[PDB]
Amino acid sequence: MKVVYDDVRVLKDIIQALARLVDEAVLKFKQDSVELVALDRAHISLISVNLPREMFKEYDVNDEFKFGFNTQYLMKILKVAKRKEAIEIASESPDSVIINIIGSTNREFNVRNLEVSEQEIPEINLQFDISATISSDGFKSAISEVSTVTDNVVVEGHEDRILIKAEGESEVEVEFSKDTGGLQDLEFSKESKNSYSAEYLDDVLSLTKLSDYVKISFGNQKPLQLFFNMEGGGKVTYLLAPK
């Protein structure tokens, strides 16, 4: 089996979020997709990745292959690239993954495959009281701003606007409205207001580099969901449990 993706940076950006959520993970290379699903250390947040075969320059996968890895380690090897450079992942046996990072120099890594105990995460289908689409940069700025004074990020949902706010001894409110042009799309079905861990939201901020907009969905007594819709068809979904 062998894949080639033309820009390792993209993969860096996902793995960085992953590495902050979890010690070890497994990229499942499948026939028509490369999939990854990981509950965090503490089992509050779920990250799900889907990378369609259409995205890859080369894609030879016949059978499911599980690439188990030390997230932090995979991080190192992905960081080697600073310009846009291709990543090559191949395997001949179940025991070994060979990663090639191509630039002016070709960096080969013969990695010993990890068998990571993977649990059956029960499947979602949750209705959201609100889901709204704003800019990723905006969402980064928003969370960055608020986290500076609180580790409980309040997310508020209304018929015309979404607020990202802090409510402690400091009061900060970052508004994306329709009229402001900040709120690009609004799927409303009920007023919502809930709090979410700021440090979990910080782990995940690398994901904002994946797309121009982030679809964000939540509701009263429901989890926050970040949906990142990548060019080529990739999908990264982040599901955070509340306070």
Binding site: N70, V80, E108, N110
Partner: protein, 243 residues
């Protein structure tokens, strides 16, 4: 003595390198230029820098041989104050060495001379089974990329191809350098293999800023010689011992 180095910045990196290995040194000033040589405390690295008369402009001696002692930290401390496009006029007397920068405005720093042990110099004259000529950029790039992945650098050759490797129980990093590869300017010799302290080879990276071309020597159970070709037949030779 009085000497003017126009590329004051690039010069500065030569000394910044030396400081990693020595804490004190002498400029030995003769009619043919300035020489700086020493061995690191652990007696693994032996460095020999030669800056010919021609390397500087307006090179002027006062006597047959002049020995100027200095703490590297201090010289580097003042040298850290270089601005991008400015030149260095460095000149000496009996009491103090003075460094003068000349660009947007004239700036000079005075530094008292100190007595440095000189009288017992290590001699290195060895023949090497393998020799390669290489762009220093390509060299330093890979070493910087590798230095994070291990404490030992493993190097070897086969059929005039040059391999930098990092072996671990959990993964191995590998870089093939070759003529056809395009990475090597030249390469010849036997198929020999060796290993060297990664920390020591890494400090060497800076010379990137002082030299464009470079020579690499090694062999089974002998030193790695790194020759950094400098302007006007100058050289910064680094001998690092095997393991």
């Amino acid at each position: 003595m009085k000497a003017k180095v126009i590329d004051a910045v690039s010069f500065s990196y030569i000394l910044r390198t030396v400081g990693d290995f020595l804490s004190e040194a002498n400029f030995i000033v003769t009619k043919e230029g300035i020489r700086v040589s020493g061995i690191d405390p652990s007696r693994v690295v032996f460095l020999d820098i030669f800056l010919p008369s021609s390397y500087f402009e307006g090179f002027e001696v006062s006597q047959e041989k002049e020995i100027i002692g200095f703490k590297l930290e201090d010289v580097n401390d003042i040298l850290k104050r270089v601005l991008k496009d400015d030149t260095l006029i460095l000149s000496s007397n009996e009491s103090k060495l003075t460094l003068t920068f000349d660009g947007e405005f004239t700036r000079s720093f005075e530094l008292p001379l100190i007595q440095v042990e000189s009288t017992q110099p290590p001699s290195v004259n060895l023949e090497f089974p393998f020799k390669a000529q290489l762009l220093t950029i390509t060299f330093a790039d890979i070493i910087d990329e590798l230095s994070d992945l291990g404490e030992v650098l493993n190097i070897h050759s086969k059929e005039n191809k040059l391999y930098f490797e990092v072996i671990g129980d959990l993964s191995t990093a590998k870089v093939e350098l070759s003529t056809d590869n395009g990475t090597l300017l030249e390469a010849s010799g036997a198929d020999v293999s060796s290993s060297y302290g990664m920390e020591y080879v890494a400090n060497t990276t800076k010379m990137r800023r002082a030299s464009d071309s470079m020579e690499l020597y090694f062999g089974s159970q002998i030193p790695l010689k790194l020759r950094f070709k400098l302007p006007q037949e100058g050289y910064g030779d680094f001998y690092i011992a095997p393991r």
